[PDB]
Design a protein around this ligand. Structure first.
Ligand SMILES: CCCCCCCCCCCCCCCCCC(=O)OC[C@H](COP(=O)([O-])OCC[N+](C)(C)C)OC(=O)CCCCCCCCCCCCCCCCC
Ligand SMILES: CCCCCCCCCCC[C@H](O)CC(=O)SCCNC(=O)CCNC(=O)[C@H](O)C(C)(C)COP(=O)(O)O
Ligand code: SF4
Ligand code: SF4
Ligand code: SF4
Lengths: 115, 115, 209, 115, 176, 85, 155
């Protein structure tokens, strides 16, 4: 499945010796939080599409290096790092919740910048 | 005689150089030329409040270690004895405790400078 | 080539940017008012001021955006609008090799949620915006003047603030201290009205009112 | 149109409240500020200059505006407390070097075309 | 294409550790630093004996300004104010008026040499090569007012550095 | 020694004496600064400061708002510093 | 003669002054970079006796190199007032002379003159490191023509 890399190169990004399960558990938590999102939101369908590809993607390939190459996300440690961000984004997305229509149409000439 | 004449001449020479230092160059001074220097902008008020440094522990061990060097100073005349075995054992003994004190001082934070 | 002087134009980048512009527009219809891709392949997102934090957070954290570097945060002062200030965000995505522009609007008396939470780089950029223009930002940690001198009056970059300023400086010997006086220029700044009265670009001909 | 979200204060009452302790925070340290910066001026003319600056900003009748001067005065207090303004910046409030501009119409007519 | 600048792991064999230990105790990299300072001591200093040996310049050098005149003698400036219009720092002030003989020149052509940025934009804008930046750069003065050149001082410069400015533009006009 | 309401009375009217823009004649126990002695809100802040520094302890803003007369200062200091008599 | 004795003595002091100028670097803007090139071995400011020394208590001349911003203007005066005062000020570049490029700004004083008395003015933007060497050489000439003792003898 690939030898344990001595370092990730990036400072602070510690090497994850067990990255496969970490990706699987976080991705399941992604679809978990997306459950609290009603269907109508474009955020739900898009994020589910991204994660569902990724979830069936991490489980298929057992090797780390083929996973990193095919994921197109750099080192594996970045993938858990970004998947964590997607988790926090979806959680705080639930608060603001931008499915609602535009809060206020701007003034007539706020945009349109020839002076 | 000889030693005190040399001591006298040095302090008179130094004091004369001060006297010509503060009197030969005449002064055109004011209250802004006597202001304390703080790399330009106004000082916030300091230079006499408690300025606590960190090497106090090793500063005071120097005083302890300086007493060790006082104890082992008479070694040049100690070698001119008829019982060097006892002199050698005791001379190394003081060095051992001097090394031992440093080693134990080292192990328990000691030489490390407080943050 | 038939255009040795005209800068070449990329359509693939235009299509990719346009597709992403629609993507962000559908994701957060609550703040995204209008989106446009300029002729030289640059994307601008026009959000409502309340969406300053949510929109930036999405661009920073979404797996398909990953815009994780605030290049700069500036505003353009346009007095002719009701909200003269126009705060502009510039973000760069290292993973996807693209840059985005997020712009809001704000009048004189309105606080904007400081983006220090999302981008810690904004912290110092926020002080410049307040100092130069006067836009106050709520929840900012240490909002204070950054560039102008201590006890400075007004906001310089505002279009209604004169270029030479209102006050000059001088060492006054009577008080033995550098003092401030009303400005008195030895030579006034000769303003040059050099705008040709003939239309330049018919493409941007604003329709008559 | 007639309604816009506020800065800190919801009406004039709490806006006036935030002015009072700002004046409180400005009253107390004036003798301390005078001591800190070696002010030539005594304490007394320091206190009313704070009073006069607070007085000239009296016609304001908008909660959002009053918040802006309140926070702006807070920075001015902050700049003065942690020796960010020097003597020259403090003396800037006392317009000393400039001659008094007369207010009668006759004097203005005598000196220039100033309306 | 990237390269890892600092990813060297020292060897742990008995040879390498002793060399590092020998380097530590017997200061070697410090001696190598010392040994090379000695090398520069015996080298050739690059100092030029100012002012007997002035530095090397180029014909494009921008220094003190000057108004030149035609070989006939009449000035080149016809007061088109291009130099004043393009001056980034607005250091140029020009006032023109019909001369007695007809063809009219400036009555006031002042350059503020403490406001000038020496960008050379004036000499490019000039359609008659009237205002140029001469080769001189040693016109430092004791008083601020002496810097504020007017038409007379600039015209004097044109009649002083003409033997040099003529050659410089003679060598550089083809590039422009 | 203990503290009594008279003690508050004398020191309160003491500290109002030093106030420059006060009049010792019309100054009374019932004197209303807005009404009787003609001050402003910024003025009223000064006395309640002169109150707290001379009394020592700190009096917040919430009570400095509606407290207006030397009665109110003496009554309110009494409960804060436990003067029940 | 008394005048002759005061004449030689003045020359000795003036020689000791002009042969040792210790600038207190006020490196502000791009004018400072060119001044360091004067310290670079190409021109070797040190060789003229003039060597860079910090701590204005131990410096003779100020070399104002760069724009003088209104915010820092008190700092310029304070570091000027703290020099043991056989003292001179050299202004480098158009900005320090009279404002230069930023003469019309809201936060740049139109010349360092308004804060401190100014000796020889060095024009340029930036003045080349050779031009500054000429400026420092001009100050040495100015120090040479100082009649401090002669004036005292004729007071
Ligand atoms: C070993 C050194 C050998 C040479 C030393 C010569 C003396 C130098 C002393 C310092 C300069 C002052 C001096 O000579 O006379 C002081 C005299 C003192 O009288 P003064 O009135 O000329 O002082 C200068 C002017 N006021 C007072 C306004 C500051 O000053 C001068 O000579 C400077 C002119
Ligand atoms: C120490 C050295 C420097 C020393 C010098 C220092 C001078 C500067 C000090 C900082 C001044 C500060 O910025 C002032 C500010 O923010 S705001 C002033 C008051 N303006 C308002 O509050 C608006 C509404 N106005 C009112 O509420 C009423 O006018 C009044 C206040 C009378 C109460 O009325 P009531 O009673 O009804
Ligand atoms: S070189 Fe000087 S005078 Fe000529 S355009 Fe530039 S700033 Fe103006
Ligand atoms: S550009 Fe040349 S010709 Fe035109 S006004 Fe200037 S100096 Fe005269
Ligand atoms: S004069 Fe020119 S080089 Fe010198 S500080 Fe100003 S802009 Fe920079």
């Amino acid at each position: 499945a690939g030898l344990l890399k001595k370092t990730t190169g990036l400072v602070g990004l510690a090497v994850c010796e067990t990255p496969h399960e970490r990706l699987k558990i976080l991705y399941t938590k992604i679809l978990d939080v997306l459950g609290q999102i009603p269907k109508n939101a474009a955020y739900r369908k898009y994020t589910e599409q991204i994660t569902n590809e990724k979830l069936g993607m991490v489980k298929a390939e057992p090797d780390v290096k083929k996973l990193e190459e095919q994921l197109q996300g750099g080192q594996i440690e970045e993938v858990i790092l970004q998947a964590e961000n997607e988790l926090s984004l979806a959680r705080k997305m639930l608060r603001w919740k931008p499915w609602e229509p535009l809060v206020e149409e701007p003034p007539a000439n706020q945009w349109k910048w020839p002076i | 005689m000889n030693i005190m004449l040399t001591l006298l001449t040095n302090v008179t020479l130094a004091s004369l150089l001060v006297l010509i230092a503060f009197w030969l160059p005449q002064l055109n001074a004011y209250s802004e030329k006597t202001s304390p220097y703080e790399c330009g902008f106004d000082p916030m008020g300091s230079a006499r409040l408690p300025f606590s440094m960190k090497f106090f522990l090793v500063a005071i061990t120097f005083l302890l270690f300086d007493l060790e060097i006082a104890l082992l100073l008479p070694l040049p005349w100690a070698s001119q004895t008829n019982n060097l075995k006892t002199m050698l054992t005791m001379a190394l003994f003081l060095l051992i405790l001097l090394a031992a004190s440093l080693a134990y001082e080292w192990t328990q934070k000691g030489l490390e400078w407080a943050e | 080539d038939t255009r040795p002087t005209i800068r070449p134009r990329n359509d693939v980048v235009h299509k990719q940017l346009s597709a992403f512009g629609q993507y962000v527009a559908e994701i957060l219809p609550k703040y995204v008012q209008q989106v446009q891709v300029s002729c030289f392949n640059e994307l601008e997102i026009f959000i409502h001021p309340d969406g300053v934090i949510p929109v930036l957070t999405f661009l920073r954290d979404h797996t398909n955006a990953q815009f994780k570097s605030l290049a700069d945060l500036t505003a353009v002062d346009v007095p002719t609008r009701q909200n003269r200030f126009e705060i502009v965000y510039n973000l760069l995505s290292l993973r996807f090799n693209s840059q985005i522009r997020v712009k809001t609007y704000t009048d004189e008396l309105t606080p904007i949620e400081s983006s220090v939470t999302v981008y810690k780089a904004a912290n110092w950029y926020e002080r410049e915006i307040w100092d130069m223009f006067g836009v106050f930002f709520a929840n900012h940690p240490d909002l204070r003047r950054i560039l102008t001198g201590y006890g400075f009056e007004g906001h310089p970059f505002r279009k209604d603030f004169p270029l030479s300023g209102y006050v000059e400086l001088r060492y006054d010997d009577e008080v033995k201290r550098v003092v401030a006086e009303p400005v008195e220029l030895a030579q006034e700044f000769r303003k040059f009205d050099l705008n040709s009265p003939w239309e330049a670009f018919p493409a941007y001909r604003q329709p008559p009112e | 149109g007639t309604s816009v979200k506020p800065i800190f204060s919801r009406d004039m009452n709490e806006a006036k409240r935030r002015v009072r302790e700002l004046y409180r925070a400005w009253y107390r340290e004036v003798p301390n500020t005078v001591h800190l910066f070696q002010l030539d001026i005594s304490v007394k003319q320091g206190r009313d200059k704070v009073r006069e600056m607070f007085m000239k900003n009296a016609h304001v009748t908008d909660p959002r505006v009053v918040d802006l001067l309140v926070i702006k005065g807070k920075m001015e207090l902050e700049e003065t407390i942690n020796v960010w303004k020097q003597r020259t910046h403090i003396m800037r409030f006392f317009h000393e070097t400039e001659a008094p501009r007369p207010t009668d119409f006759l004097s203005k007519f005598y000196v220039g075309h100033d309306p | 294409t990237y390269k890892f600048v600092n990813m060297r792991e020292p060897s742990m064999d008995m040879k390498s550790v002793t060399d590092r230990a020998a380097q530590t105790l017997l200061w070697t990299e410090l001696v190598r630093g010392l040994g090379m300072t000695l090398s520069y001591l015996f080298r050739e200093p690059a100092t030029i004996n100012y002012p007997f040996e002035k530095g090397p310049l180029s014909p494009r050098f921008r220094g003190e300004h000057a108004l030149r005149r035609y070989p006939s003698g009449e000035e080149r400036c016809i007061a088109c104010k291009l130099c004043e219009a393009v001056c980034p720092a607005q250091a140029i002030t020009i006032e023109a008026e019909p001369r007695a003989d007809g063809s009219r020149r400036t009555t006031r052509y002042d350059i503020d040499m403490t406001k000038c940025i020496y960008c050379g934009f004036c000499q490019e804008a000039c359609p008659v090569d009237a205002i140029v930046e001469g080769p001189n750069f040693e016109f430092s003065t004791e008083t601020h007012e002496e810097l504020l050149y007017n038409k007379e001082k600039l015209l004097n410069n044109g009649d002083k550095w003409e033997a040099e400015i003529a050659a410089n533009i003679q060598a550089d006009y083809l590039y422009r | 020694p203990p503290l009594t309401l008279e003690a508050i009375k004398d020191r309160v009217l003491y500290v109002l004496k030093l106030y420059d823009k006060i009049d010792p004649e019309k100054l009374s126990v019932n004197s209303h600064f807005m009404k009787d002695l003609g001050l402003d809100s910024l003025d009223q802040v000064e006395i309640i400061m002169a109150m707290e520094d001379e009394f020592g302890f700190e009096i917040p803003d919430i009570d400095a708002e509606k407290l207006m007369c030397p009665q109110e200062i003496v009554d309110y200091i009494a409960d804060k510093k436990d003067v029940y008599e | 003669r008394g005048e002759y004795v005061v004449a030689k003595l003045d020359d000795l002091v003036n020689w000791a002054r002009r042969s040792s100028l210790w600038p207190m670097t006020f490196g502000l803007a791009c004018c400072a970079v060119e001044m360091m090139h004067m310290a670079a071995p190409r021109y070797d400011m040190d060789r003229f006796g003039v060597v860079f020394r910090a701590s204005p208590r131990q410096s003779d001349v100020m070399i104002v190199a760069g724009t003088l911003t209104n915010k820092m203007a008190p700092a310029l005066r304070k570091v000027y007032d703290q020099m043991p005062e056989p003292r001179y000020v050299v202004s480098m570049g158009s900005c320090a002379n009279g404002g230069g490029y930023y003469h019309y700004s809201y936060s740049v004083v139109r010349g360092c003159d308004r804060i401190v008395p100014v000796d020889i003015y060095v024009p340029g933007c930036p003045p080349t490191a050779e031009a500054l060497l000429y400026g420092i050489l001009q100050l040495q000439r100015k120090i040479k023509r100082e009649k401090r003792l002669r004036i005292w003898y004729r007071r």
